[PDB]
Amino acid sequence: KSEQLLRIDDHDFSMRPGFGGPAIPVGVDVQVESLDSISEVDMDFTMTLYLRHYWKDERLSFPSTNNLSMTFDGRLVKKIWVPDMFFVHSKRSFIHDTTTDNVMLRVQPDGKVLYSLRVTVTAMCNMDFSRFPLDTQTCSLEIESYAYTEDDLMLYWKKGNDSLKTDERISLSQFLIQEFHTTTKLAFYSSTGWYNRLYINFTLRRHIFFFLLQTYFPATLMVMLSWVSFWIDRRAVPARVPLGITTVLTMSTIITGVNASMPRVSYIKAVDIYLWVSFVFVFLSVLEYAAVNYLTTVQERKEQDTHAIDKYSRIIFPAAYILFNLIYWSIFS
Template sequence: MKPTALALRLLYLAWLWPTTLLSESQFPSRRKHKDVYLGENTRHKHGGRIDFKMKKSDSTKSLLIKSEQLLRIDDHDFAMRPGFGGSAIPVGIDVQVESIDSISEVNMDFTMTLYLRHYWQDDRLAFPSSSNKSRTFDSRLVKKIWVPDVFFVHSKRSFIHDTTMENIMLRVYPDGNILYSVRITVTALCSMDFSSFPLDTQNCSLELESCWYNRLYINFILRRHIFFFMLQTYFPTMLMVMLSWVSFWIDRRAVPARVSLGITTVLTMSTIITGVSASMPQVSYVKAVDIYLWASFLFVFLSVIEYAAVNYFTTVEEMKKLKRGKLPVSYDATQAMAYDGCFHDNELDLSPFPELPTTPSTEQAAPPRNSSAEPPPTEGTRLWRKRSVRHNINFIMSNSYMIDSYSRIIFPVAYLLFNIIYWSLYS
């Protein structure tokens, strides 16, 4: 190397060295955060830009380590309960019900969302503090310490809410007291008694138990609103029963009208009973709604039977009159029964038969009424009762239209009496 070139190089180094020292003296923080500025220079090469004020060191990891060190997580075996080997630990529990989501009569269960809170003391988690009254943690620390083994006894399904993260909170106080809160949705069994359904009141209990074998009962008194069932079951049933009474005001010879009305009401009642039974559990006892539905069905069925009796007695009486000659020869009883209310009794010739002439033989054959050999029957004899019942039956058969007249009063009064007894017993 030539001497001239060597002198120029030494001169360059002499100029560069003071400048470097001046830069480090003016910015001492460059030596402390050399790696930060190195990353900044690297990003400038890729075209990125970082604000100097926003760049700070991340201390989350160090704080987490400090929290675990403060609570001495690694110094104890948290697989054991506090004070293991001594007396039992008292654990306080309270429940805040957020909502009762559903009550199912078919499955005999109820679903609710609640906040379940536990309170206990663990001296192993006590920490010295002069400023913080408590420290709050999430579910990550819960997995590292001891918590009470509380579970729901008759739970069918349950889960802890995890949106947007697990709904678990752990709060530790300096003296070792702990609050553990969790948000749960649980579906629990409820043994319901439907003897008075839907006028019933159910007592459902949520039971919590621990391997200390203690059980906590939380009772819920559930009273059913009747208005929904009045609209869906009771009012339609009442209307069908009253509709079946319309046939009592239709002429007894209007066979198609009265038969179709009776069959329609019977089928409608069957549909209502089937719909109610499908939405109820299959229990072995009779429910209050079953009594009302089947009693109403009986009233509808009896209205059909009533017309069958009226039609039969009318047919029998008209056939008797036809044989006796009280009806014209051209009268067709079958055709008259098919008329739509156009045929009436006043159209018939109901003139009585002429009295038969009496002859001496008939007068001698007829026994005297006041004969001493056979006294007349008294009112208390059995023969008089037989003649009375027979006379009443003959009177009803000869006046079958009176059955409809009596039914117009008997059926509504009986149904009204049934409703009074029913609602007074179950309401």
Template structure:
């Protein structure tokens, strides 16, 4: 019989003792040190788990409006990590403490699960943004298709002109030839253009922060998730190897 401690499994080493005793009470102690070949576990456990975590990061580069793609990718990685954890635990003796492989697999599972929650946050903020923009459009309807626009001359008089006329400085055909140098028609496009710009600016100001936050989540996740996972691997392998 040999009592083994699997708290560092599969990066553990086990020491088993053998005691021999003769008729004359002479005793011989032999210690066997058992070490595992880590390559098998790297290939069957660690490498697939790392690939699943890296695969979950692909969703950060997918458009946030592609809901089926990002949701399917997140669910697939979560289910695959659950399968890996179940398979490893099925081949292990039932112990009441946490093993080293459990730490690695469950931390990897947390990273995969957080990537799903990350998209949930992005999708929620996008929905809030669209809802606010819809309310603003209903409150401030756009009046872009106006058939007439006011025209102001340089002398301060206003006249009605067709909205299809060219904007800018044009000569008024009704003005005599000698007065063409004095009176230039300036199409100010006063058909609520300034008001529309103001309303668009208001909508942009309200929705800008949400848009930036929505993009910032994916943008920063591309750096935070890989950096944190690499930092975890450095600590893990330095402690248990």
């Protein structure tokens, strides 16, 4: 029997190796396989990865006439001591079990142990949509021991920044992923003490042009169309009102559609400011004509060319819109 080469019954595996002395160093190697999905309403992302652990345990040493290693399946995990890593700030996770448990153990003759497994984890990530759609989001994934403090277990990356590998085909439907790097930081819990924590960081960016076209182009086009009505003669009363009254309806439909398409984030964003300012510029154009029409009628009654209001509007409106655009794109870059 292979398990008889390891003195399983002659050793206690309920305690850590090197009990009562210096901590046992444990190395971790992570390989990212894919990114499944990201949810903006609930602010979470899903990841699939390979997790590996390295440590040395002298109780598992077995004699041999060569350097061949022995491979065991997941059934040996319950009989020996293994590190209990867990993911912080996670919502749910599981280990794949098709067609059997995806757990592997490899033991060297001296006693070096390799522990590999495949896991899928969902983690939280705080997001800020103030600068939508020009926003940049940074998320992270954290790994930490559960029950052992730094006095008993010393956790670290095995090969520095070479311990993180990513698949060549990792991609998202609506985001750009870049800048994968690893950091470490000590965390404190008042109940037990100090712990070591490992981080995996990355950054997300959007496709600016798609939002630019769809949102901003119709708004500017409709504003210019509303401007155009200033060059039509005032005497054609049933030929100037329809343009102004039919620009507002189109703007309202555009706003409703854009609101429907965007994610349900309930606070003011950068896109909302642009759309509601443009709505006022269209609204004021109709108010301008009512004043012109009213003043003309008063003169006719009193007494019985181009009005100066139109001349001033043709210059004032484009300047105001250009100044607003300059300020808006200077603030939001």
